Curated annotation (Swiss-Prot):
It comes from the Eukaryota. Belongs to the heparin-binding growth factors family. Heparin binds at N22. It holds the Pfam family FGF. It comes from Homo sapiens (Human). Changing R123E: Reduced integrin-binding. Defective in integrin-, heparin- and FGFR1-binding, and defective in inducing FGF1 signaling, cell proliferation and cell migration. The keyword Lipoprotein does not apply. This is Fibroblast growth factor 1.
């Protein structure tokens, strides 16, 4: 395919917080579908349940609202009420430590899930291997 296959350890048995080491924000999918990051651990919209659709391919869903993380045709993350092709991400190990999520739909363009230091999501085309914005650590809820 277009990418390596080093996979992170850990599993999907329990929900997780997706912590971005760039600004220290947790990925958040709000009830209205907007996606961004927050440093508030008490937020009820940062609890995410991941599930494997195929080895290395995942859905990332808000446990609070049931919404799926998805990246649209112009690279913007949004919350989807139903699972579709834009909701699948290739979950990979990075720097022998972190988890990265590449849009399956746009994998050939290397579009990643990423959070900027200010907590706003990065648009797909603005992401790339090597950035801290794409590095996540799944933490217990």
């Amino acid at each position: 395919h277009h990418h390596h296959f080093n996979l992170p350890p850990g599993n999907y048995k329990k929900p997780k917080l997706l912590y971005c080491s760039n600004g220290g924000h947790f990925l958040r999918i709000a009830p209205d579908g907007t996606v961004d990051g927050t440093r508030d651990r008490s937020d009820q919209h940062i609890q995410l349940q991941l599930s494997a659709e195929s080895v290395g391919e995942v859905y990332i869903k808000s446990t609070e609202t049931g919404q799926y993380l998805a990246m649209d045709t112009d690279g913007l993350l949004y919350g989807s009420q139903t699972p579709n092709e834009e909701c699948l991400f290739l979950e990979r190990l990075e720097e022998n430590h972190y988890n990265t999520y590449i849009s399956k739909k746009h994998a050939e363009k290397n579009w990643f899930v990423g959070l900027k230091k200010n907590g706003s999501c990065k648009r797909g085309p603005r992401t790339h291997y090597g950035q801290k914005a794409i590095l996540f650590l799944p933490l217990p809820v």
